[PDB]
Amino acid sequence: GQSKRVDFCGKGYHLMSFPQSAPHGVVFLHVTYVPAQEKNFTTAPAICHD
Amino acid sequence: PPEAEVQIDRLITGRLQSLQTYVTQQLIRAAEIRASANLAATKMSECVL
Numbered sequence A: 001g002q003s004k005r006v007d008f009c010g011k012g013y014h015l016m017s018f019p020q021s022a023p024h025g026v027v028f029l030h031v032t033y034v035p036a037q038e039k040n041f042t043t044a045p046a047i048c049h050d
Numbered sequence B: 001p002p003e004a005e006v007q008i009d010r011l012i013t014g015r016l017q018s019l020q021t022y023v024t025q026q027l028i029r030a031a032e033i034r035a036s037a038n039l040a041a042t043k044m045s046e047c048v049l
């Protein structure tokens, strides 16, 4: 499944995961989405029409 | 010395048993504290972050 728990399955917004067997354990490859190339804008709580 | 190594043996056995008991109880308490710390880290990641 896809988890919404923060930092439970990787640094970033979890996309998916892949298991791999390893000697006496498991290795999870956590594929996650990380934002990048931020830009600053002027924001407003709401816009007043007529 | 021939008769001083039998009472010292009892002292050594008692003190070793006390140390082992302390280490075992501290290991169990450390396991409990580690579980609590893992919960605290989970709460920091899930709720603070």
Ligand SMILES: *[C@@H]1O[C@H](CO)[C@@H](O)[C@H](O)[C@H]1NC(C)=O
Pocket (backbone or CB within 6 Å): A037, A038, A039, A040
């Ligand atoms: C504008 O955005 C940059 C990243 O592109 C950020 O580092 C910077 O602090 C912003 N400038 C401000 C808030 O004045």
